[PDB]
Design a protein around this nucleic acid. Structure first.
Ligand SMILES: [Mn+2]
Length: 475
RNA sequence: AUGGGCCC
RNA sequence: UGGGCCC
C-alpha cells in the first residue's frame, strides 16, 4: 500500500518489545540458523545502523494503479471466479446473528475470548471480556453503538500495530525484517463475521482445488486428496510472492469486493462496504499515526479467505492478460493466502506472466531458487505448500505432509516458558511424517527430560485419520 | 501480542 | 479455558 501521510501524536500506544521465546536443550544440539524476531529498537543482534521502525513499514512500496482496460479484465476474472465460487457454495449468505458471530457456527470457530481488542479500547486499558460476553454471546455495549455506526455506514477505526513475536531466519532477524500484525477493533471483526460469516464457513467446509482454497483443510488427511489431484497434471508450479498482502492494489481489492460479495449472491449490502473499509486504513505505531492506501491488514476476520480469493483471481487475470482462450478449466490451483500451487497440462509460461502480475503490484518468483526462472516439468513431489512437501507414504500408499528437518529443528529449538511438553506433543504430530530415524533424531535432545510420543503410536493415529478403512485393513 | 486453518 | 503448527 501507498503511505500517504505520516504524523506524530501526543498519545503513545504500547508496543510489546519482549520475546517470550526462550531456547531449549534442542537449540544447543541443532544450532538452527533461526531466532526470535527483533522486537526492541536496540536489540544487540540487529545489523547496524538498525532502524526497526523504518524496516517494518518498508513493505509499503506504493499502490499500483490499473488502466481502465486492466480493471475491466480484472472485473471479468473476479466475476468469473465469483460465479464458480458461489456455484459450489450456494447463496445462503444472510447476516449471521450477533450470537452466532461470537459463538461461531459449523465450519467457523468462535471468536477468541481474551485476545487484543484493538483501538480505541487499548487506550482505555480494557479487555474484550469487558465489551463482549463470549459465554453468552451478547451484551456489554459500547459495541452496539459501533454496530449502529457500521449499520449506518459511518463507522471509522484505526489498526493497532503489533510486532510479531515469532521465530525467523537469522538473516531476516539481523536485517530487522520483523513482521507486523494489524490488530483491528473487536467490533469490526464481529461485524465482518456477521456480514460474511456464513460464506466463510461454507468455503472452509468446501476447501480444495475446485474453489482453489485450502483454507479449512487438515494437511494430515487432505494431503492425500490434494496430492492425487495435482499428480494428474504435466506441469506444477510453486509460485512465491513478495509481500503479497501489502501489495494488493486498491483497484484490485475494490473490484474483487464488488464482484464477489454482491447482494444478488445473498449478501447484505454492508458486506461489500465493511470489506471496502480495509482498503484505506489508519495505523497506530507508538507516537506515529500512519495512513495507508492499498494492501490488506492481517487482523481482519476473513484475511486468509480474502487473500485466497485474490490469489485465484490474479492467476486468471495474469494468464488472460498474456494468452487468449484462457478459462477456469485451463489450469488448476489451490491457495492458502499468498501460498499457492498451480498446475496445468498446457505448458504455461510463468516467466512471461511476471509483468502481468506486476500490473497488479505483485512480484512472482520461483520457489526453487535455482538461478533460472519458472520452468515446465515440475511435479507435485518437488513443491511445497504450507511448509510441507508431498511425499508418498510407503506403508499406506497415501501422500503425507513432510516438513523439512531444518524447519522442525528450528520449531523444536525454541519455546515459551512452560509450554515445552505440550509443544513436543503437537510438533511430534508434524515430525512423524519424516520417518522413524529422523523422528528419533529430532527428539533425542529431550529424552530423559520429557515424554516423547512413540513413532508407532502417532503413525497408527495418522493411518486411521487419513483413511479409516486402511487402518482396519491392516488388522 | 491480530485474524483465520487445523491438531492436542 | 490453555498450548503448538501453518497461512
Ligand atoms: Mn490501486
Amino acid at each position: 500500500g501507498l503511505i500517504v501521510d505520516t504524523r506524530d501524536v501526543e498519545e503513545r500506544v504500547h508496543v510489546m518489545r519482549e520475546t517470550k521465546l526462550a531456547p531449549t536443550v534442542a537449540h544447543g544440539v541443532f544450532n538452527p540458523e533461526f531466532g526470535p524476531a527483533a522486537l526492541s529498537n536496540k536489540d544487540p543482534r540487529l545489523n547496524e545502523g538498525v532502524v526497526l521502525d523504518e524496516v517494518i513499514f518498508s513493505k509499503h512500496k506504493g499502490d499500483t494503479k490499473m488502466s481502465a482496460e486492466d480493471k475491466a479484465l480484472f472485473r471479468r476474472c473476479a466475476a468469473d471466479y465469483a460465479s464458480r465460487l458461489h456455484s459450489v457454495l450456494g447463496t445462503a449468505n444472510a447476516p449471521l446473528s450477533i450470537y452466532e458471530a461470537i459463538k461461531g457456527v459449523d465450519g467457523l470457530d468462535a471468536m477468541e475470548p481474551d485476545t487484543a481488542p484493538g483501538l480505541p479500547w487499548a487506550l482505555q486499558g480494557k479487555r474484550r471480556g469487558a465489551l463482549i460476553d463470549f459465554e453468552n454471546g451478547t451484551v456489554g455495549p459500547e459495541v452496539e453503538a459501533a454496530l449502529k455506526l457500521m449499520e449506518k455506514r459511518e463507522y471509522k477505526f484505526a489498526c493497532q500495530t503489533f510486532l510479531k513475536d515469532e521465530i525467523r531466519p537469522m538473516e531476516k532477524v539481523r536485517a530487522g525484517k520483523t513482521r507486523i500484525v494489524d490488530v483491528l477493533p473487536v467490533e469490526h471483526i464481529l461485524y465482518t463475521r456477521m456480514m460474511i460469516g456464513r460464506f466463510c464457513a461454507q468455503m472452509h467446509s468446501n476447501n480444495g482445488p475446485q474453489i482453489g482454497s485450502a483454507v479449512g483443510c487438515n494437511p494430515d488427511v487432505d494431503w492425500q486428496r490434494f496430492g492425487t489431484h495435482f499428480a494428474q497434471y504435466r506441469n506444477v508450479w510453486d509460485v512465491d510472492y513478495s509481500a503479497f498482502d501489502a501489495n494488493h492494489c486498491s483497484d484490485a481489492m475494490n473490484i474483487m469486493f464488488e464482484e464477489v460479495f454482491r447482494t444478488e449472491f445473498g449478501f447484505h449490502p454492508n458486506a461489500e462496504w465493511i470489506l471496502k473499509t480495509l482498503v484505506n486504513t489508519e495505523h497506530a505505531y507508538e507516537n506515529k499515526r500512519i495512513t495507508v492506501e492499498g494492501g490488506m491488514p492481517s487482523g481482519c476476520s476473513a484475511t486468509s479467505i480474502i487473500n485466497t480469493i485474490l490469489n485465484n483471481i490474479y492467476v486468471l487475470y495474469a494468464l488472460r492478460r498474456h494468452y487468449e482462450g484462457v478459462e477456469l478449466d485451463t489450469y488448476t490451483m489451490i491457495s492458502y493466502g499468498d501460498d499457492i500451487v498451480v498446475a496445468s497440462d498446457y505448458d504455461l509460461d510463468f516467466e512471461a506472466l511476471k509483468p502481468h502480475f506486476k500490473s497488479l503490484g505483485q512480484t512472482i518468483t520461483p520457489a526453487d531458487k535455482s538461478d533460472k526462472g519458472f520452468v515446465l516439468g515440475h511435479s507435485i513431489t518437488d513443491v511445497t505448500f504450507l511448509k510441507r512437501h508431498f511425499h508418498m507414504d510407503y506403508g499406506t500408499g497415501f501422500y503425507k505432509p513432510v516438513m523439512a528437518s531444518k524447519t522442525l529443528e528450528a520449531i523444536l529449538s525454541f519455546a515459551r516458558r512452560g509450554t515445552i511438553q505440550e509443544k513436543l506433543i503437537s510438533v511430534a504430530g508434524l515430525a512423524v511424517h519424516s520417518g522413524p530415524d529422523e523422528y528419533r533424531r529430532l527428539f533425542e535432545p529431550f529424552q530423559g527430560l520429557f515424554e516423547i510420543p512413540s513413532y508407532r503410536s502417532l503413525y497408527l493415529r495418522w493411518v486411521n485419520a487419513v483413511c479409516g478403512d486402511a487402518a482396519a485393513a491392516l488388522e
